[PDB]
Structures are given as C-alpha cells and as structure tokens.
RNA sequence: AAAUUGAAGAGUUUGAUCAUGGCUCAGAUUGAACGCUGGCGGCAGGCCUAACACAUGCAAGUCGAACGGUAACAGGAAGAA
C-alpha cells in the first residue's frame, strides 16, 4: 500500500580489546502518500538487517498531517538540535523543490509543491526530525476556526 | 483581461558521534583569451593594454540672386579671313 525510501546509511563503529566492530545505522521514511509520515532508524551488523529495522520502525511512529491539494495550509519554520528548516506553500507545477533528506520526507507524505530550505547543519537524520517538528505542529483553516470559535471569510 | 509562479545541496577534522568552523565543488554570466575541431545562414559585436609614437589618402564647406571681376573652358558677336 504505502510508500518507503531509504535515505542515508553510515557505518558507524565502537571500539574492543579485539579491535573495531563495525556497525550500520539505517534510516528511512514511510508514508501513505497522502498525510502520514513515519520516520525509523535502525542499527545492525549487516546493512540488510538495519534497513529492516528501520522500516519497522517507521511504521509504528508515524503521524498525520493536514495537507491542501498536495501541499502546506501555511509556510512552516521547523528545528531540531543544529537543523533549521523553512517551507513554503507553493503553487501548482513546481514540484518538490528542496534538499536532500527534505526531499525524501515530503515525497512520501504526498506534499506535491513546495520551496523548501535547510539552513543550519544538514545532517540527514536532524533534518528529517526537524521536518516533521515543522510538518506536524502546521495547522489547518479547520482547527483554527475551532480553537477561536469562528468560521469566517478567513475559511 | 494580463503586467512576475519564488528559495535543493554535496565533499573534506573523528576509532565513531553531535556541534562549531574554514577550504572545495555542482549554476548563471563575459568586449573574453588559449587548446582541439569546424558545413550554411540570420541578427548583433569586435585595442579592456601605451591619453605611446605615427608614413599615406580621405573626415567642412558652400554661396555669382552681396561685390570688383576674368584664369580657365563653353558658346556667341564684331572681325582677321
């Protein structure tokens, strides 16, 4: 049914008497193509193994988002430690214009056009967190006709 | 009626990590130059340096309806023939 990248892969490491053992982290996103969004990172010896934990992980975790014809009601700020990360609600044919580990996360949720920007560091896996910190405190006409108790020409 | 619709990152410090922070790269542009190559046309462009020095030709004349005029070369006239 739903849709699965993997984005970045590192050997990571941790050192013994013997000498190094060496390790894989993996990292990747799943998503309904239309609003939910998962994010999972796993850790193994073998690379396969990692990917597999991470996908699991993705799946349980994961979260809904209020989109507009495939794309954002709002343009968004997001963070998370050294990654900041701006979108922006674009018009129809511009595509998923923005970065690396951005791009990924928006494609699955089933954002269609937007003008994204990663400041700060770019590190694949603060990025993806600082993604979704921005996608999921983004709210509708909807809730915000509720929370004021309104539904106005601002509907 | 229409007159702007616009924003991508990556590599490199560590045994590994997150951060800070430099170096480097991917784009657009040019009165360009250099190298290898080269069929045709259209529209543009072409001493950025020595405001260094210049042979040769041409780049400001016109007016006889302002004037006295004849040296030219066109006729005409008296007149040698």
Same mark, same amino acid.
């Given at each position: 049914?739903?849709?699965?990248?993997?984005?970045?892969?590192?050997?990571?490491?941790?050192?013994?008497?013997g000498?190094?053992?060496?390790?894989?982290?993996?990292?990747?996103?799943?998503?309904?193509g239309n !609003?939910?969004?998962?994010? /999972?990172?796993?850790? %193994?010896?073998?690379?396969?193994?990692?990917?597999?934990?991470?996908?699991e $992980? *993705?799946?349980?975790?994961?979260?809904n988002?209020?989109?507009?014809?495939?794309?954002?009601?709002?343009?968004?700020?997001?963070?998370?430690?050294?990654?900041?990360?701006?979108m922006?609600?674009?018009?129809?044919?511009? !595509?998923?214009?923005?970065? /690396?580990?951005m791009? %990924?996360?928006?494609?699955?949720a089933?954002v269609?056009?937007?003008?994204? $920007? *990663?400041?700060?560091?770019?590190?694949?896996?603060?990025?993806?967190?600082?993604t979704?910190?921005g996608?999921?405190?983004?709210?509708?006409?909807?809730?915000?006709?509720?929370?004021?108790?309104?539904?106005?020409?601002?509907?």
């Amino acid at each position: 049914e739903l849709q699965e990248k993997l984005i970045a892969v590192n050997r990571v490491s941790k050192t013994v008497k013997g000498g190094r053992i060496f390790s894989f982290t993996a990292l990747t996103v799943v998503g309904d193509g239309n !609003g939910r969004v998962g994010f /999972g990172y796993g850790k %193994a010896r073998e690379v396969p193994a990692a990917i597999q934990k991470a996908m699991e $992980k *993705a799946r349980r975790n994961m979260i809904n988002v209020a989109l507009n014809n495939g794309t954002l009601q709002h343009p968004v700020k997001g963070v998370h430690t050294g990654s900041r990360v701006f979108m922006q609600p674009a018009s129809e044919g511009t !595509g998923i214009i923005a970065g /690396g580990a951005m791009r %990924a996360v928006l494609e699955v949720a089933g954002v269609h056009n937007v003008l994204a $920007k *990663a400041y700060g560091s770019t590190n694949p896996i603060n990025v993806v967190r600082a993604t979704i910190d921005g996608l999921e405190n983004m709210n509708s006409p909807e809730m915000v006709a509720a929370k004021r108790g309104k539904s106005v020409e601002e509907i």
